[PDB]
Amino acid sequence: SLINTKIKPFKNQAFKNGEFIEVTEKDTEGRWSVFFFYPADFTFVCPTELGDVADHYEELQKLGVDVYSVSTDTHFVHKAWHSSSETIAKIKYAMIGDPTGALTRNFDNMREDEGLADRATFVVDPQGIIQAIEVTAEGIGRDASDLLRKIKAAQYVAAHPGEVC
Template sequence: MSLINTEIKPFQATAFKQGEFVQVTDADVKGKWAIFFFYPADFTFVCPTELGDVADHYEELQKLGVEVYSVSTDTHFVHKAWHDASETIAKINYYMLGDQNGTITNNFGVMREGQGLADRATFLVDPEGIIQAMEVTAEGIGRDADDLLRKVKAAQYVAAHPGEVCPAKWKEGEATLAPSLDLVGKI
Protein backbone atom coordinates (compact mmCIF):
# COMPACT_ATOMS: atom_id res chain seq x y z
CA MET A 1 0.00 0.00 0.00
CA SER A 2 1.43 3.37 -1.02
CA LEU A 3 1.68 6.14 1.54
CA ILE A 4 1.88 8.86 -1.12
CA ASN A 5 -0.61 11.68 -0.38
CA THR A 6 -1.30 10.38 3.13
CA GLU A 7 -0.69 12.33 6.33
CA ILE A 8 2.04 11.22 8.71
CA LYS A 9 0.76 9.53 11.85
CA PRO A 10 1.27 10.79 15.40
CA PHE A 11 4.58 9.98 17.10
CA GLN A 12 6.90 11.21 19.77
CA ALA A 13 10.55 10.29 20.14
CA THR A 14 13.81 11.37 21.68
CA ALA A 15 16.47 12.46 19.23
CA PHE A 16 20.14 13.21 19.41
CA LYS A 17 20.91 16.55 17.74
CA GLN A 18 24.04 18.65 18.02
CA GLY A 19 25.17 17.24 21.36
CA GLU A 20 21.77 17.22 23.04
CA PHE A 21 18.79 14.94 23.55
CA VAL A 22 15.59 16.61 22.35
CA GLN A 23 11.97 15.57 22.09
CA VAL A 24 10.37 15.47 18.63
CA THR A 25 6.70 14.89 17.75
CA ASP A 26 4.69 14.84 14.55
CA ALA A 27 3.50 18.37 15.45
CA ASP A 28 7.12 19.59 15.26
CA VAL A 29 7.34 18.37 11.67
CA LYS A 30 4.37 20.31 10.34
CA GLY A 31 4.88 23.77 8.90
CA LYS A 32 8.05 22.93 6.97
CA TRP A 33 9.31 20.35 4.50
CA ALA A 34 10.78 17.24 6.10
CA ILE A 35 12.79 14.20 5.12
CA PHE A 36 12.44 10.99 7.12
CA PHE A 37 15.55 8.95 6.38
CA PHE A 38 15.16 5.40 7.73
CA TYR A 39 18.12 3.04 7.99
CA PRO A 40 18.60 -0.41 9.58
CA ALA A 41 21.10 0.22 12.39
CA ASP A 42 23.90 2.29 13.85
CA PHE A 43 27.48 0.99 13.69
CA THR A 44 26.91 -0.73 10.34
CA PHE A 45 28.33 -0.37 6.83
CA VAL A 46 26.14 1.23 4.15
CA CYS A 47 24.24 3.35 6.69
CA PRO A 48 27.10 5.70 7.65
CA THR A 49 27.90 6.37 3.98
CA GLU A 50 24.29 7.43 3.39
CA LEU A 51 23.96 9.47 6.57
CA GLY A 52 27.27 11.21 5.84
CA ASP A 53 26.11 12.00 2.30
CA VAL A 54 22.94 13.62 3.67
CA ALA A 55 25.05 15.51 6.24
CA ASP A 56 27.11 16.93 3.36
CA HIS A 57 23.88 18.31 1.84
CA TYR A 58 22.19 19.39 5.09
CA GLU A 59 23.06 23.08 4.78
CA GLU A 60 21.55 23.23 1.29
CA LEU A 61 18.45 21.37 2.48
CA GLN A 62 18.10 23.85 5.35
CA LYS A 63 18.24 26.75 2.87
CA LEU A 64 15.29 25.10 1.09
CA GLY A 65 13.35 24.99 4.38
CA VAL A 66 13.79 21.23 4.81
CA GLU A 67 14.46 19.49 8.12
CA VAL A 68 16.01 16.01 8.17
CA TYR A 69 15.05 13.25 10.60
CA SER A 70 17.15 10.10 10.38
CA VAL A 71 15.40 7.16 12.03
CA SER A 72 16.54 3.74 13.21
CA THR A 73 15.28 1.45 15.93
CA ASP A 74 18.39 2.18 17.98
CA THR A 75 18.04 4.42 21.05
CA HIS A 76 19.08 8.05 21.19
CA PHE A 77 21.91 6.93 23.48
CA VAL A 78 23.30 4.67 20.75
CA HIS A 79 23.01 7.56 18.27
CA LYS A 80 25.15 9.69 20.60
CA ALA A 81 27.72 6.92 21.02
CA TRP A 82 27.93 6.47 17.23
CA HIS A 83 28.20 10.24 16.74
CA ASP A 84 31.09 10.30 19.23
CA ALA A 85 32.82 7.26 17.71
CA SER A 86 32.57 7.86 13.95
CA GLU A 87 34.20 10.68 11.99
CA THR A 88 31.50 10.35 9.31
CA ILE A 89 28.59 10.43 11.77
CA ALA A 90 30.22 13.26 13.78
CA LYS A 91 29.45 15.69 10.93
CA ILE A 92 25.68 15.11 11.29
CA ASN A 93 23.79 18.19 12.50
CA TYR A 94 20.25 16.94 11.78
CA TYR A 95 17.94 14.98 14.10
CA MET A 96 18.81 11.34 14.78
CA LEU A 97 15.54 9.89 16.10
CA GLY A 98 15.59 6.89 18.41
CA ASP A 99 12.68 4.59 17.59
CA GLN A 100 13.34 1.65 19.87
CA ASN A 101 9.61 0.91 20.25
CA GLY A 102 9.16 0.97 16.45
CA THR A 103 6.28 3.47 16.40
CA ILE A 104 7.68 5.72 13.67
CA THR A 105 9.07 2.83 11.64
CA ASN A 106 5.71 1.04 11.75
CA ASN A 107 3.82 4.29 11.02
CA PHE A 108 5.74 4.57 7.75
CA GLY A 109 5.36 0.85 7.01
CA VAL A 110 9.08 0.08 6.81
CA MET A 111 9.64 -2.27 9.79
CA ARG A 112 11.25 -5.55 8.79
CA GLU A 113 8.92 -8.18 10.17
CA GLY A 114 10.50 -10.27 12.90
CA GLN A 115 13.78 -8.31 12.84
CA GLY A 116 13.02 -5.08 14.67
CA LEU A 117 14.98 -3.11 12.05
CA ALA A 118 13.89 -0.43 9.60
CA ASP A 119 14.19 -0.87 5.87
CA ARG A 120 16.42 1.55 3.98
CA ALA A 121 13.67 4.09 3.14
CA THR A 122 13.24 7.81 2.48
CA PHE A 123 10.05 9.87 2.75
CA LEU A 124 9.60 13.50 1.69
CA VAL A 125 6.86 15.22 3.68
CA ASP A 126 5.34 18.60 2.78
CA PRO A 127 4.55 21.36 5.32
CA GLU A 128 1.01 20.00 5.82
CA GLY A 129 2.44 16.63 6.91
CA ILE A 130 1.54 14.89 3.62
CA ILE A 131 3.96 12.37 2.11
CA GLN A 132 4.96 13.54 -1.39
CA ALA A 133 7.73 11.07 -2.28
CA MET A 134 9.07 7.78 -1.00
CA GLU A 135 11.89 5.40 -1.84
CA VAL A 136 12.69 1.98 -0.39
CA THR A 137 15.80 0.05 -1.37
CA ALA A 138 17.20 -3.37 -0.56
CA GLU A 139 19.72 -3.77 2.24
CA GLY A 140 22.85 -3.42 0.11
CA ILE A 141 21.74 -0.49 -2.08
CA GLY A 142 22.73 2.91 -0.74
CA ARG A 143 20.83 6.08 -1.58
CA ASP A 144 22.14 9.27 -3.19
CA ALA A 145 21.60 12.64 -1.49
CA ASP A 146 22.04 14.48 -4.81
CA ASP A 147 18.98 12.71 -6.19
CA LEU A 148 17.11 13.32 -2.94
CA LEU A 149 17.89 17.04 -3.25
CA ARG A 150 16.60 17.00 -6.85
CA LYS A 151 13.35 15.38 -5.67
CA VAL A 152 12.94 17.99 -2.92
CA LYS A 153 13.34 20.81 -5.45
CA ALA A 154 10.88 19.14 -7.85
CA ALA A 155 8.29 18.61 -5.10
CA GLN A 156 8.64 22.20 -3.93
CA TYR A 157 8.34 23.46 -7.51
CA VAL A 158 5.18 21.44 -8.17
CA ALA A 159 3.67 22.62 -4.86
CA ALA A 160 4.35 26.26 -5.78
CA HIS A 161 3.19 25.92 -9.41
CA PRO A 162 -0.19 24.14 -9.60
CA GLY A 163 -0.84 22.80 -13.07
CA GLU A 164 2.83 22.11 -13.81
CA VAL A 165 4.77 18.86 -13.44
CA CYS A 166 8.48 18.04 -13.54
CA PRO A 167 9.59 15.50 -16.16
CA ALA A 168 12.23 12.80 -15.67
CA LYS A 169 15.67 14.07 -14.69
CA TRP A 170 14.26 17.58 -14.16
CA LYS A 171 16.71 19.99 -12.59
CA GLU A 172 15.98 23.40 -11.08
CA GLY A 173 15.57 26.01 -13.81
CA GLU A 174 14.73 23.52 -16.56
CA ALA A 175 11.45 23.37 -18.46
CA THR A 176 8.43 21.77 -16.85
CA LEU A 177 5.24 20.44 -18.41
CA ALA A 178 1.66 21.68 -18.17
CA PRO A 179 -0.46 18.56 -18.67
CA SER A 180 -3.28 19.14 -21.15
CA LEU A 181 -5.21 17.44 -23.89
CA ASP A 182 -2.86 19.08 -26.40
CA LEU A 183 0.14 17.18 -24.95
CA VAL A 184 -1.42 13.71 -25.21
CA GLY A 185 0.73 11.61 -27.53
CA LYS A 186 3.14 14.49 -28.26
CA ILE A 187 5.82 13.71 -25.67
Protein backbone atom coordinates in the same frame (compact mmCIF):
# COMPACT_ATOMS: atom_id res chain seq x y z
CA SER B 1 0.95 3.06 -0.84
CA LEU B 2 1.57 5.79 1.71
CA ILE B 3 2.23 8.25 -1.14
CA ASN B 4 -0.13 11.18 -0.79
CA THR B 5 -1.19 10.40 2.79
CA LYS B 6 -0.69 12.50 5.89
CA ILE B 7 2.02 11.41 8.29
CA LYS B 8 0.87 10.12 11.63
CA PRO B 9 1.45 11.57 15.09
CA PHE B 10 4.63 10.45 16.86
CA LYS B 11 6.85 11.25 19.85
CA ASN B 12 10.43 10.05 20.01
CA GLN B 13 13.66 10.95 21.71
CA ALA B 14 16.51 12.03 19.50
CA PHE B 15 20.12 13.01 19.58
CA LYS B 16 20.79 16.38 17.90
CA ASN B 17 24.32 17.75 18.04
CA GLY B 18 25.41 17.18 21.60
CA GLU B 19 22.09 16.70 23.42
CA PHE B 20 18.81 14.78 23.68
CA ILE B 21 15.53 16.24 22.43
CA GLU B 22 11.95 15.19 21.91
CA VAL B 23 10.49 15.27 18.37
CA THR B 24 6.73 15.07 17.52
CA GLU B 25 4.60 15.61 14.43
CA LYS B 26 4.16 19.13 15.79
CA ASP B 27 7.82 19.88 14.98
CA THR B 28 7.18 19.02 11.32
CA GLU B 29 4.10 21.17 10.77
CA GLY B 30 4.87 24.11 8.53
CA ARG B 31 8.10 22.65 7.29
CA TRP B 32 9.34 20.26 4.65
CA SER B 33 10.64 17.06 6.22
CA VAL B 34 12.87 14.17 5.26
CA PHE B 35 12.48 10.98 7.33
CA PHE B 36 15.55 8.91 6.59
CA PHE B 37 15.19 5.35 7.86
CA TYR B 38 18.05 2.88 8.11
CA PRO B 39 18.40 -0.54 9.79
CA ALA B 40 20.99 -0.10 12.53
CA ASP B 41 23.76 1.95 14.15
CA PHE B 42 27.25 0.47 14.51
CA THR B 43 26.70 -2.13 11.84
CA PHE B 44 29.59 -2.88 9.47
CA VAL B 45 28.15 -0.98 6.50
CA CYS B 46 29.71 2.46 5.84
CA PRO B 47 27.46 5.36 6.76
CA THR B 48 27.88 6.87 3.27
CA GLU B 49 24.14 7.44 2.94
CA LEU B 50 23.85 9.37 6.23
CA GLY B 51 27.03 11.30 5.40
CA ASP B 52 25.96 12.41 1.95
CA VAL B 53 22.77 13.73 3.48
CA ALA B 54 24.98 15.41 6.08
CA ASP B 55 27.05 17.00 3.28
CA HIS B 56 23.88 18.48 1.72
CA TYR B 57 22.23 19.47 5.01
CA GLU B 58 23.18 23.15 4.78
CA GLU B 59 21.54 23.29 1.38
CA LEU B 60 18.50 21.40 2.69
CA GLN B 61 18.15 23.81 5.58
CA LYS B 62 18.28 26.68 3.05
CA LEU B 63 15.34 25.07 1.24
CA GLY B 64 13.68 24.93 4.63
CA VAL B 65 13.94 21.15 4.75
CA ASP B 66 14.31 19.46 8.15
CA VAL B 67 16.03 16.05 8.35
CA TYR B 68 15.35 13.22 10.82
CA SER B 69 17.30 10.05 10.39
CA VAL B 70 15.54 7.15 12.14
CA SER B 71 16.44 3.66 13.34
CA THR B 72 15.20 1.36 16.12
CA ASP B 73 18.39 1.93 18.14
CA THR B 74 17.99 4.25 21.22
CA HIS B 75 19.08 7.91 21.25
CA PHE B 76 21.77 6.68 23.67
CA VAL B 77 23.32 4.58 20.91
CA HIS B 78 23.04 7.45 18.46
CA LYS B 79 25.06 9.62 20.82
CA ALA B 80 27.72 6.94 21.19
CA TRP B 81 27.80 6.31 17.43
CA HIS B 82 27.91 10.03 16.65
CA SER B 83 30.90 10.69 18.82
CA SER B 84 32.75 7.65 17.47
CA SER B 85 32.48 7.75 13.68
CA GLU B 86 34.06 10.17 11.24
CA THR B 87 30.99 10.25 9.04
CA ILE B 88 28.28 10.10 11.69
CA ALA B 89 30.12 13.00 13.38
CA LYS B 90 29.26 15.37 10.53
CA ILE B 91 25.57 14.92 11.25
CA LYS B 92 23.93 18.05 12.60
CA TYR B 93 20.35 16.92 11.96
CA ALA B 94 18.33 15.12 14.66
CA MET B 95 18.92 11.35 15.00
CA ILE B 96 15.65 9.85 16.18
CA GLY B 97 15.68 6.67 18.24
CA ASP B 98 12.68 4.36 17.71
CA PRO B 99 13.02 1.39 20.09
CA THR B 100 9.22 0.85 20.40
CA GLY B 101 9.17 0.74 16.60
CA ALA B 102 6.04 2.91 16.48
CA LEU B 103 7.44 5.61 14.21
CA THR B 104 8.91 2.96 11.92
CA ARG B 105 5.52 1.22 11.80
CA ASN B 106 3.72 4.54 11.23
CA PHE B 107 5.61 4.64 7.92
CA ASP B 108 4.94 0.90 7.47
CA ASN B 109 8.69 0.42 7.24
CA MET B 110 9.38 -2.34 9.79
CA ARG B 111 11.25 -5.62 8.96
CA GLU B 112 9.12 -7.38 11.61
CA ASP B 113 11.25 -10.52 11.77
CA GLU B 114 14.37 -8.42 12.42
CA GLY B 115 12.92 -5.58 14.49
CA LEU B 116 14.82 -3.19 12.25
CA ALA B 117 13.51 -0.47 9.91
CA ASP B 118 14.01 -0.82 6.15
CA ARG B 119 16.21 1.58 4.12
CA ALA B 120 13.50 4.14 3.20
CA THR B 121 13.34 7.88 2.72
CA PHE B 122 10.14 9.88 2.87
CA VAL B 123 9.68 13.47 1.69
CA VAL B 124 6.86 15.16 3.64
CA ASP B 125 5.49 18.60 2.81
CA PRO B 126 4.43 21.45 5.20
CA GLN B 127 0.87 20.06 5.35
CA GLY B 128 2.17 16.65 6.40
CA ILE B 129 1.70 14.93 3.05
CA ILE B 130 4.19 12.32 1.88
CA GLN B 131 5.29 13.42 -1.65
CA ALA B 132 8.12 10.99 -2.40
CA ILE B 133 9.15 7.54 -1.16
CA GLU B 134 12.38 5.66 -1.85
CA VAL B 135 13.36 2.26 -0.44
CA THR B 136 16.39 0.19 -1.39
CA ALA B 137 17.93 -3.17 -0.42
CA GLU B 138 21.32 -3.42 1.33
CA GLY B 139 24.07 -2.25 -1.03
CA ILE B 140 21.83 -0.22 -3.31
CA GLY B 141 22.75 3.26 -2.22
CA ARG B 142 20.47 6.23 -1.80
CA ASP B 143 21.72 9.36 -3.55
CA ALA B 144 21.56 12.62 -1.62
CA SER B 145 21.82 14.64 -4.84
CA ASP B 146 18.79 12.82 -6.28
CA LEU B 147 16.97 13.44 -3.01
CA LEU B 148 17.67 17.18 -3.35
CA ARG B 149 16.36 17.15 -6.93
CA LYS B 150 13.11 15.55 -5.79
CA ILE B 151 12.70 18.02 -2.98
CA LYS B 152 13.22 20.92 -5.35
CA ALA B 153 10.79 19.33 -7.79
CA ALA B 154 8.21 18.85 -5.04
CA GLN B 155 8.67 22.39 -3.79
CA TYR B 156 8.09 23.67 -7.31
CA VAL B 157 4.87 21.70 -7.87
CA ALA B 158 3.52 23.18 -4.64
CA ALA B 159 4.16 26.64 -6.01
CA HIS B 160 3.03 25.92 -9.56
CA PRO B 161 0.14 23.41 -9.33
CA GLY B 162 -0.87 21.57 -12.50
CA GLU B 163 2.35 22.31 -14.35
CA VAL B 164 1.64 20.81 -17.79
CA CYS B 165 5.25 19.64 -18.40
